[PDB]
């Protein structure tokens, strides 16, 4: 219904927080050495 | 002082990532309330 | 609905959690831009 | 370079929430498939 659309949209955003996370940490790695 | 241009770009780049993140997590409330 | 509005709520907290950690984001993003 | 420092420190502590925040969709989702 209107929940599995909510959880297949939920998921892929949970995926793209993962993806911001990980580009932050390389501009980390680049801010510090 | 590249690389504190790199990591300025980089880091503009994930804020609107993160814009994008909200805004969709937000149909997905209207999705899920109706 | 009850649980629907227990979702709503949970999922409209860390929407208000992200557009802080976007503003922090921006802060630190200014603070190296004039250095 | 001070700066640079505190920035660091900054955008960590800012990737942990981030971190946080998928969690607990993670567990909205679980919530959602019940």
Do not use: T, W
């Not at 959880?7 to 993962?18: A, F, S, Y």
Request: aromatic content about 0%; proline content about 0%; overall charge negative.
């Amino acid at each position: 219904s209107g929940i599995n659309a909510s959880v297949v949209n939920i998921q892929k955003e949970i995926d793209r927080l993962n993806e911001v996370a990980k580009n932050l940490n390389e501009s980390l790695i680049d801010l510090q050495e």
